[PDB]
Amino acid sequence: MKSVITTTISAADAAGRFPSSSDLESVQGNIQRAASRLEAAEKLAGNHEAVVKEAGDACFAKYSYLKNPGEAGDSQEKINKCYRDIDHYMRLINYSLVVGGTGPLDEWCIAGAREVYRTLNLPSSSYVAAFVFTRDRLCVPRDMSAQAGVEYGAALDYVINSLC
């Protein structure tokens, strides 16, 4: 799971080395930035359903043509999966904010995603629509602190940039 601690340890393991100052400083940085990514993570976890629901509504608002027969929203089961996928992604962002790195996003949702969506006809743009909406929707200090806005917005940009 990519993270400060794992990245550093496995650099040292590759070299045969005990941990040294670089490694301990790296974890210390994990301590400093802990307190605002965990804030984002808790706000996200506490309101996941409303965020997921605004994001999916924004997606299908931008691409109403998806509800046509043959598109990826031509049935209520299919639209509901769409919001499910968005929730999966936001759960993984929650994980990413808790770990401190993009590990969870990377392995659990980015990896097969271009092939899977190419094959089930899921336009990349619709997810980008849902994450861009969420990103721009966030409000400081209403929704969370400034440096937690940074962390949250950041994971969202990462997931967006994996679909470009």
């Binding site: 799971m1 993270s3 601690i5 794992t6 340890i9 496995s10 040292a12 393991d13 045969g16 080395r17 005990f18 941990p19 040294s20 490694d23 301990l24 974890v27 210390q28 994990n30 301590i31 802990a34 307190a35 965990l38 993570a41 808790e42 996200l44 976890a45 996941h48 759960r91 929650n94 994980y95 808790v98 770990v99 401190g100 590990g103 969870p104 659990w108």
Partner: protein, 176 residues
């Protein structure tokens, strides 16, 4: 490999659940003891040579048959092999300790070790005497109770950390 947070995330994931509030407060406790943990790691790695030759010399101390013809520390080549293995295990338990998870100890070091040893002829009751000596050398250094060397740290109870490092040494003594 996983660390403390990745481990909480893998467990949350098996239920498809965002990270519980209970788990978040556990993690902020982990973060609160961040600096004690770094001192723990520093007190092992700054003494690694001491810990490893203490333990191997002791293993041989209690059973000199290891260095009689046919014992597994007999030639210089085998003695040096054993010192390397002591050092390697200590390195993977200092990874464990710095990680907060035994993930990397189990994945990159213990997996197949028992088999490898069975194959080579490496006495396993002796490897674990060495590892159990390393266990005490290490929790001494963590707890700052080592006889011939101290390390100036601030006053606090580092007992949870010592128990952690002893649990990783016991994972080793059990893998074989």
């Amino acid at each position: 490999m996983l660390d403390a947070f990745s481990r909480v995330v893998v467990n949350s994931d098996s239920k498809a659940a965002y990270v519980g509030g209970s788990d978040l407060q556990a993690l902020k406790t982990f973060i609160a003891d961040g600096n004690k943990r770094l001192d723990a790691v520093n007190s092992i790695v700054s003494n690694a040579s001491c810990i490893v030759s203490d333990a191997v010399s002791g293993m041989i101390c209690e059973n000199p048959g290891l260095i009689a013809p046919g014992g597994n520390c007999y030639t210089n080549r085998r003695m040096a092999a054993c010192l390397r293995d002591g050092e390697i295990i200590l390195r993977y338990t200092s990874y464990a300790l710095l990680a907060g998870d035994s993930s990397v100890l189990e994945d990159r070091c213990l997996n197949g070790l028992k088999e490898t040893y069975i194959a080579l002829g490496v006495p396993t009751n002796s490897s674990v005497r060495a590892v159990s000596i390393m266990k005490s050398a290490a929790v001494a250094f963590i707890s700052n109770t080592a006889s011939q060397r101290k390390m100036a740290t601030t006053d606090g109870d580092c007992s949870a950390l010592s128990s952690e490092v002893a649990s990783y040494c016991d994972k080793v003594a059990a893998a074989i």
